[PDB]
Design a protein around this ligand. Sequence first.
Ligand SMILES: COc1cc2[se]c(C(=O)CCC(=O)O)cc2cc1OCCCOc1cc2cc(C(=O)CCC(=O)O)[se]c2cc1OC
Lengths: 177, 177
Amino acid sequence: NVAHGLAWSYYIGYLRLILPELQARIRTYNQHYRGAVSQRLYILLPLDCGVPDNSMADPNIRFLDKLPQQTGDHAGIKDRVYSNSIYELLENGQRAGTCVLEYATPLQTLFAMSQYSFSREDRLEQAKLFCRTLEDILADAPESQNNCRLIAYQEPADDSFSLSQEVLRHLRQEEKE
Amino acid sequence: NVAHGLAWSYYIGYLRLILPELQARIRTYNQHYRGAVSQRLYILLPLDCGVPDNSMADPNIRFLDKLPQQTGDHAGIKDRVYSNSIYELLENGQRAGTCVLEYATPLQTLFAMSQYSFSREDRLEQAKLFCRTLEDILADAPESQNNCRLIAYQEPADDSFSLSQEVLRHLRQEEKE
Ligand SMILES: COc1cc2[se]c(C(=O)CCC(=O)O)cc2cc1OCCCOc1cc2cc(C(=O)CCC(=O)O)[se]c2cc1OC
């Protein structure tokens, strides 16, 4: 599968290097800036493989601040910085949650291969495989340990579903556990 | 192929976003720091799929400075910084060249899938496919325009081949053209 290898390498290429030190960067911010970060990387997995080159497309999901940068030497890039963004989530207009939110960038490729002049059905199937594979990796992975959540979703249409309520729901079971 | 999709997404995920503005960042450095950058991203493609989590493994390939950082909003990461490193290349002990050098990170996954308890033969075949595919993309790509070189190589052994001479050779045809 293309999606099988896109999921492995997203783990070996990004997650296995940022998740180990993610929660420590979160504590650093939460000390110097109940409206706090959920100590976990919430990966938006748009099943439509629609990832933006710009999360504000769904209101109530608003950017707040950037997480302290992690610099690590990688593949010849000295102090390769790993940047991550913290977003506020709003319910009824008020801040009901703050978390580190970002799209799975590999799903973007499944899109370009299906955006037409693969099939839109193959995209759904392989996006699902990517989610199912990456979730199985992150289950057996030793670096993924109460630090990552895979938010798979599919807005049937723009005038439709509230990701804010979808991600906030995950934020509540966090606090409940 | 896994390597077919690893090459596409390395393009759609990194190259197509950094190569457009790469040469401009190079001019900025070359103005404020004949021993200058070759205006192109030289991607080391270790056919052994051996990419380091640390290029100084081969002497005469030495780090000099970091390229001015490119900040761009990507997949929810605000000001996602794209960092790239400039390396000096030495011949007979003197600086014969300076260039932006970095390993292809996707080859690292082909390694973990072949590092054993895939096959080491499948790794060579798929590393080759990754190189051949990524070179065909970067040929038809509009963002890859006298800005990228794919340095495929295979050191038969440690006590062996000088990448310095291999990359410098590419640096000379640059100056010769
Ligand atoms: C190596 O395999 C991955 C490696 C990585 Se790194 C990374 C992020 O940082 C998240 C934000 C972003 O993607 O920009 C995602 C990711 C996803 C991966 O998927 C497997 C398919 C390979 O194709 C991709 C290659 C790259 C390489 C990038 C770099 O920077 C060079 C240095 C380095 O790899 O560290 Se980015 C990228 C996105 C690719 O396909 C989406």
